[PDB]
């Protein structure tokens, strides 16, 4: 009484595992996935296999790639469009192959980070006058949008009552939950995350009217920081 996943159904679960390993999602549905892989890929898609697929798609892979991140039978049509819609049916991310990027667009967070010491500073920071070196903001009044460019992604940015789109050279995706901005994590002899990313806040709706950012305001050399809050809505 084992369920049989069709080609399409299993691909969604295959992507769902990748999204969980990337840490963009916290849950996964893998019922029937292993048989789907043995049948349609001719291999065991265990954790080592998936880690190699992720490493290759985002970093080491070169040439055309297929829908299952490999570089009659399915998955023999290798793309050159630069991205895959990693789409589980429960969540989705538009993810760009490392070959489509002008070099490496990631940072190795396994290396010891330059430690940042606490320092007194305003609990509120204005969106129009950000002194924090980890964040840069652009307001587009014409289209009622705010873009926050996060330049030190290792410093957590927590969203409160926000509905945003994350743009990066790694993946683009939407976030509708409170808490620290989730970022793709790629294992390649260590943990890697995007080197920068953009938070896009649309204010042309009402649901961002209370959107607020909480982060460490990093200032300079020796690095210093203090808790601050940036109201967007």
């Amino acid at each position, epitope marked *: 009484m084992e369920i049989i996943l069709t080609l*399409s159904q299993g691909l969604k679960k295959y992507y769902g595992k990748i999204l969980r390993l990337l840490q963009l999602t916290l849950e996964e549905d893998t019922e029937g996935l292993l048989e789907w892989c*043995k*049948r*349609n890929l001719g291999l065991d898609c265990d954790d080592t296999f998936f880690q190699k697929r992720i490493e290759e798609f985002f970093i080491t892979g070169e040439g055309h790639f297929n829908e299952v991140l490999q570089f*009659a*039978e*399915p998955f023999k049509s290798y793309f050159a469009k630069g991205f895959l819609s990693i789409d589980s049916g429960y969540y989705s991310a538009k993810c760009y192959s490392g070959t489509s990027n002008s070099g490496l667009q990631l940072i190795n967070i396994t290396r010891h980070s330059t430690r940042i010491v606490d320092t007194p500073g305003p609990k509120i920071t204005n969106l129009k006058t950000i002194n924090c070196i980890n964040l840069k903001a652009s307001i587009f009044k014409e289209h009622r949008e705010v873009e926050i460019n996060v330049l030190l992604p290792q410093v957590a940015v927590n969203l409160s009552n926000c509905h945003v789109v994350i743009k990066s050279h790694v993946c683009d995706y939407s976030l509708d939950i409170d808490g620290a901005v989730r970022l793709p994590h790629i294992y390649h002899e260590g943990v890697f995350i995007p080197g920068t990313y953009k938070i896009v806040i649309d204010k042309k709706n009402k649901l961002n009217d209370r959107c607020t950012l909480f982060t460490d305001c990093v200032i300079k050399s020796v690095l210093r920081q203090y808790k601050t809050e940036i109201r967007i809505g």
Partner: antibody
Framework: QVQLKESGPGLVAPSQSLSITCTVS????????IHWVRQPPGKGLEWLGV???????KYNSALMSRLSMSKDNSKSQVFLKMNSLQTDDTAMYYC??????????????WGQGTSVTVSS | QIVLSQSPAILSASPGEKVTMTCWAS?????MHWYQQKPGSSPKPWIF???NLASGVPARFSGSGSGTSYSLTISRVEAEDAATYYC?????????FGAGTKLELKR
């Protein structure tokens, strides 16, 4: 054209094992799985198992203790072996090509079948 | 296992009549295959995935259904349609077949 042809022993004793071969042409076993299905006399069809293009197998859990499958890509042949034979293993044995579509699997080409009687 | 119960066991039809045979599954499945078998021959793929006619199958055949109830319909039966028709599910292991509906032609 796509072709499948079973070959086996018409008679096997209950103490022996049953070995049947499926020889294919018009396609490569590197690209297509092969199913085995049997039909006891005047009775309905029963799926036995499959060997996929990549070599992994899946058997009917009601008989996986007695059934095994393998293949020889270079010979375009797939093999069925069944042991601990019982009288009710008497049946016509068919191989059939596995087909993959986006939203279903299918068994799109069938052999003519080979007759196996299990008797001493 | 998913048990497929085909009803009726024998369909008797005169040429030109419309007939429908049913395949009831013991639990819901996502699609149903159908095969035609004539005596002395192997099962022939007839309908793929509930409603898709296999190559060469006459347009008088159709398939429909969902969940636990699927059907095969012949809009106007012909003498050559005399045969046994089997349904088959591919939603759960092990793959299972119905025991067949035998279409008998009257004359």
């Amino acid at each position: 054209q796509v072709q499948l042809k079973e070959s086996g022993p018409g008679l096997v004793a209950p103490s022996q094992s049953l070995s049947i071969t499926c020889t294919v042409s018009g396609f490569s076993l590197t690209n297509y799985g092969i199913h085995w299905v049997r039909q006891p006399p005047g009775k309905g069809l029963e799926w036995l198992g499959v060997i996929w293009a990549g070599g992994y197998t899946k058997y009917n859990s009601a008989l996986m203790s007695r059934l095994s499958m393998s293949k020889d890509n270079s010979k375009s042949q797939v093999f069925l072996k069944m042991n601990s034979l019982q009288t009710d293993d008497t049946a016509m044995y068919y191989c059939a090509r596995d087909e993959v579509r986006r939203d279903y699997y299918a068994m799109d080409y069938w052999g003519q079948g080979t007759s196996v009687t299990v008797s001493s | 296992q998913i048990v497929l119960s085909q009803s009726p066991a024998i369909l008797s039809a005169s040429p030109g009549e419309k007939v429908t045979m049913t395949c009831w599954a013991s639990s819901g499945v996502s699609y149903m295959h159908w095969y035609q078998q004539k005596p002395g021959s192997s099962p022939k793929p007839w309908i793929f995935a509930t409603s898709n006619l296999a190559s060469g199958v006459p347009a008088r055949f159709s398939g429909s259904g969902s969940g636990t109830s699927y059907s095969l319909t012949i809009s106007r039966v012909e003498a050559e349609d005399a045969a046994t028709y089997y349904c088959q599910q591919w939603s759960f292991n092990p793959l299972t077949f119905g025991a067949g509906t035998k279409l008998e032609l009257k004359r």
